[PDB]
Amino acid sequence: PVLFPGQPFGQPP
Amino acid sequence: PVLFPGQPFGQPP
Amino acid sequence: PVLFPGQPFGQPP
Amino acid sequence: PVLFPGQPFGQPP
Amino acid sequence: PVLFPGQPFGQPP
Amino acid sequence: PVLFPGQPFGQPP
Amino acid sequence: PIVQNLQGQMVHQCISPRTLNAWVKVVEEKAFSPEVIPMFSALSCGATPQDLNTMLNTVGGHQAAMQMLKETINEEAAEWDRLHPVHAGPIAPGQMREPRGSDIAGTTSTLQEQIGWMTHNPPIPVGEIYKRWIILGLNKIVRMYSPTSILDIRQGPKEPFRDYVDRFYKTLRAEQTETLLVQNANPDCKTILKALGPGATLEEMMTACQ
Amino acid sequence: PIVQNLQGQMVHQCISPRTLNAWVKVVEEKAFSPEVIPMFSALSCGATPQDLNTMLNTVGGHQAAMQMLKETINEEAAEWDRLHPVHAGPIAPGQMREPRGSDIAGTTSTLQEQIGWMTHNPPIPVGEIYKRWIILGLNKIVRMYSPTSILDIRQGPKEPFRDYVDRFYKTLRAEQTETLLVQNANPDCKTILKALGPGATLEEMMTACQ
Amino acid sequence: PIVQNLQGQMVHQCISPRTLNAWVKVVEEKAFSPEVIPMFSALSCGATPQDLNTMLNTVGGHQAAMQMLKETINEEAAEWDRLHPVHAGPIAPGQMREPRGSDIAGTTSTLQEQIGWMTHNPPIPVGEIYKRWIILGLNKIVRMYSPTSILDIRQGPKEPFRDYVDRFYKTLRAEQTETLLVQNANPDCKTILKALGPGATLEEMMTACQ
Amino acid sequence: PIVQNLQGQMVHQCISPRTLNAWVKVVEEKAFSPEVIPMFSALSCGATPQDLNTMLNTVGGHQAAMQMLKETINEEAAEWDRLHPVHAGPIAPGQMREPRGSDIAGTTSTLQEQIGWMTHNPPIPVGEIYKRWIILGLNKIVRMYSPTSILDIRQGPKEPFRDYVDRFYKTLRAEQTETLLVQNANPDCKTILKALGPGATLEEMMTACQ
Amino acid sequence: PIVQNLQGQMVHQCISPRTLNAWVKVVEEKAFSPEVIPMFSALSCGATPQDLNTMLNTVGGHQAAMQMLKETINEEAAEWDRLHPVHAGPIAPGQMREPRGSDIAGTTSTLQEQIGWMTHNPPIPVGEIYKRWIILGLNKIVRMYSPTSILDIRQGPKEPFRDYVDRFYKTLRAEQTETLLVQNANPDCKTILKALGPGATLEEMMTACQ
Amino acid sequence: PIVQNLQGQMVHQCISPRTLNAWVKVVEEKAFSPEVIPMFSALSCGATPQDLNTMLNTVGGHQAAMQMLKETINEEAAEWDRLHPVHAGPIAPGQMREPRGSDIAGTTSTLQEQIGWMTHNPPIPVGEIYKRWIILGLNKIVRMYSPTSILDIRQGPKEPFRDYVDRFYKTLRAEQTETLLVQNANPDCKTILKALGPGATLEEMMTACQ
Ligand SMILES: O=P(O)(O)O[C@H]1[C@H](OP(=O)(O)O)[C@H](OP(=O)(O)O)[C@H](OP(=O)(O)O)[C@@H](OP(=O)(O)O)[C@H]1OP(=O)(O)O
Numbered sequence A, B, C, D, E, F: 001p002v003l004f005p006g007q008p009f010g011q012p013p
Numbered sequence G, H, I, J, K, L: 001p002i003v004q005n006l007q008g009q010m011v012h013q014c015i016s017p018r019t020l021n022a023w024v025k026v027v028e029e030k031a032f033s034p035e036v037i038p039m040f041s042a043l044s045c046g047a048t049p050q051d052l053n054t055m056l057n058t059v060g061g062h063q064a065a066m067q068m069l070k071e072t073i074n075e076e077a078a079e080w081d082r083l084h085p086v087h088a089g090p091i092a093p094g095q096m097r098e099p100r101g102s103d104i105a106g107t108t109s110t111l112q113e114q115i116g117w118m119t120h121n122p123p124i125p126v127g128e129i130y131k132r133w134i135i136l137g138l139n140k141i142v143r144m145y146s147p148t149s150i151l152d153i154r155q156g157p158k159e160p161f162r163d164y165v166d167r168f169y170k171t172l173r174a175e176q177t178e179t180l181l182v183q184n185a186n187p188d189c190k191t192i193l194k195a196l197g198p199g200a201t202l203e204e205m206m207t208a209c210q
């Protein structure tokens, strides 16, 4: 997934 | 008359 | 009709 | 006088 | 002094 | 340190 | 909307937060009073069909009026299709196609097709036709949303003439005179007005009855 | 309105949300007080007849005053027609026609005809003539909407002179002195003012009576 | 966002305080009502993926909806990766790379890469694809956040028909008719509507039942 | 007002809704306090005599002060006429005439004559002369509108020195020291101040008396 | 900030009243909630280190957080100094010097040195490095300012699932799942969720538990 | 102020209604708190001495602080006169004169002389020197207007450590540590802090004491 729970929009894993 | 009662401004008879 | 009930403005059937 | 009582600003006698 | 008590800013003695 | 307690941002020691 | 830049060319700019803000606020505070129609006509000046669609979709209340507007726009788009047929086949490459009745509403046409139609010589004012249809809708809703008929407006015994004239003419504007205005007045004021006779401006009546 | 771009040419720009917003707000809060006329004169600076029409239609109250304005505009348009007749026939192609009295009001004339008249050398300031007619209307309404006559304004025994002068001159502005101001004053203040005599500025009176 | 300057070129300008302000205010006041989607579509006009990300992160409530949006964006980015693979190796110097599904979301791609994709011929509208994914999210949340079903909307005995139609159609918009609208109506109004029959506009129904 | 465009020329632009709005709001909230004069001086920067007239007419209260301003402007216009006579005859075609004392006030002069005087080399700053006269009026009103004399300002026994200094100097500004400030102080604070002696800044006094 | 003018060049413009106004208002109303960080990142777009300093100094509360930010900026400036040493001697005349760790913070560097670093080819983005340090500070404060731990978030018996998910994820964002979300849920909702099993989107859970 | 136009030249523009509005509002709401100084420094960016004077005169309260500022400006102008004498005689025609200490304050110098000094190569930044003097005044007032000393700030028994640190550092900023912060803390928190020892960041203290 491009986005994961717990971080702001636009940040990689 | 240019304007008559009952119509908006800028409308002919 | 161009517009039908239940969808936003500017969307086809 | 340029201005007199009873008229708006910028109007002659 | 450039400024004295009792007059607005930017006015000489 | 660049900043110390008690002075505004952007001021040296 | 489609504006004129400082250099001297017509370019599409993106709708401002205030056109939307003021539009939602006027529809929220003034509901569908007649003066709300000019606001739309003034706020959407130079607006594309897509922009008009944003304005219409921004409102969150009075959905039955929105469906009135929908039906009006479909009737007008069908009449446009009937009056101005357009060929099919293949759209010629690097070329501008004819605007359908559905295109003016912005349902099939995209924004690039829209600004192509507006920045043309002679330009196809799809925004103006869409504004005409939306406005026909708005007048229709406003006329059929009037609270009371003009026959109902009658002057009270203790009410000033000014208030009666104001009510009479706000109702007359809502549903889009001379003799009728005197009939609804009480015996007072009418006593002097019947003596005045024909040929007197509204102000003569309101001055004598002041 | 018709503005001057940064390049150095007069172009039509679309009315801002604030001209409308401030106009509706001033007519809503201040009703038809005299200072409301300059607002219209300042808010509609450079405005086209269509823009003036939007401003007039935005108001939702005081419809009798709006009909006063209507009648005034028709009288002025008839006088324009009488003073400046215009030929009929066919409008020459690619040419600018003469402005009728109805054209200045924006009833028949379209916005492109309007900006053609304004961006001309010498320009036909149809917006300025329309503003003149609308303003004549506004002065007429404001004068006949005054709550009390200047004769009614009288100074109270316990009221300061400042308040009396303020009331006197707001009433004088509403209906568009020297001797009258002293007559309405109470025996106090008048005691000193009669001793002052002619040739004293308003401030001499208000200083001696302070 | 990506705007057109006065000279005549598309340049990136920095987001205004009002796009953010109005966005937070509409999500705060209107929650996730359908009309909130057009606001986002209108406020973010011309916006970069980074700008869209700022708008999304500005909201401080409804975090479960934000996670819905996250999951939707990941599904769409995986589908983009599957549909449009991109090579690896070394990015050629002074050259523009292909946009991954994660690039459109702005997680790996930087703002300079973004404006390179937008200011291109032909341009890669990464902002528009990201807007499509965010909007799919928004429609999904709005549809599944509806308070009541369309079956629940029924007209009361003392309630006017106008209010019933308004409720019916706001619910219909929330979840994205003709026969159903009459079924939920009370025996009054239905008495006349059943007599009307098929082929009547919404306004015919609301006029007869007024 | 008369502004400098981006190209590099001085052009007349139309007054903004905020100059009017802020002006009415400051005169409404702050009445005629001294700080209200700089607002006018800052809000009307670059303004034409017509613009200054709009600002003056926008106020709806304190009409006696407005008549003070009127009389001041007439006195200054008479002094201008006396100091700078102007010939009559015929205005030369395509030529700029001399500004009368009434012209600077904007009573006879039109806006085109005004911007001709401002966009000149050397320019005739009719706006600046009119601003001088209006400001002389404003200072006169503000000085004679002061609630209490400087002799009245005295420090209370339980009142802090800071409040006494604030009152003293707001009154001193309203009517346009060193020894007087100590005399009005109570025996407390004065006990230390008399010991301080001459040569101490205001802050030395307020620090020792803190 | 550093913006792009209409001509096509990057120039320094002076910070607007709204960047400051909106910044103070968001820090005042939202304290240090996570969404406050994007606001700073969006409001300070293109801002110089001096501008960032103005924004930081405008806040009047939460001074301990400001000292956290101070310490973070000093640690990052020391790391910059350690990673990128710079020579001393004499600054070459008419030449641009290397940016120290203290220079990026704006303590020694002046605004002309700053815009020299930004308007360079290749440019030294001192504003971006300073923004990185300020943002690291902000994330640190926001993470350590969280009211409760994620373990504390548990769903109530009468509370809807939507509210529990909202609380859970706002807490998760404050401190920067799948299995944990089900554990904190009550026996109701968990009854169905345990039956659902792995592989279900958040929306599947919230739909089944609706 | 002195801004950079789109063409690429530094021109004087007229102060906006918001610089004045925001300035009066911040001095009215925040009095003379430390963060009020950056506002002035940010609102008056690029401002002329005349503009700075307008900002200073717009405030209507705290006149004793204004006299502090006056005295500070006179001391600095005397020091400028002493450090940089200027010749008298006749000002050369079509030439720019030297700035006196009174000129920087704007008492004798006119706005045309000011913009001549700013638009020069090398420019004489009279606005920046005046800003330096005004700021020295502001820091002086803010330091001597602090409500309580840093010695007074002590942590309560039931008060959280966060509030104590906030109060301590707002007071420290008002009057322009490490060991002192622990001394004022109650026996609780101090129990752990004394065990922590030297070398711990503020956040280590506030985390252990959370
Ligand atoms: O209309 P809002 O959403 O409530 O925002 C406004 C508004 O913003 P604008 O300057 O862009 O118009 C103001 O002007 P108004 O049009 O409302 O008159 C302003 O000044 P006002 O005192 O005249 O309203 C103000 O008021 P304030 O800052 O004191 O709240 C302010 O409200 P916001 O702070 O919410 O932005």
Ligand SMILES: O=P(O)(O)O[C@H]1[C@H](OP(=O)(O)O)[C@H](OP(=O)(O)O)[C@H](OP(=O)(O)O)[C@@H](OP(=O)(O)O)[C@H]1OP(=O)(O)O
Pocket (backbone or CB within 6 Å): G016, G018, H016, H018, I016, I017, I018, J016, J017, J018, K016, K017, K018, L016, L017, L018
């Ligand atoms: O100058 P600011 O305080 O930074 O804000 C201005 C401004 O306010 P003032 O003219 O009172 O100074 C505009 O004035 P109006 O057009 O509203 O009369 C305005 O207008 P909009 O609200 O329509 O955008 C808009 O910028 P612009 O003049 O280019 O339209 C805007 O900046 P913000 O809205 O971002 O605060």
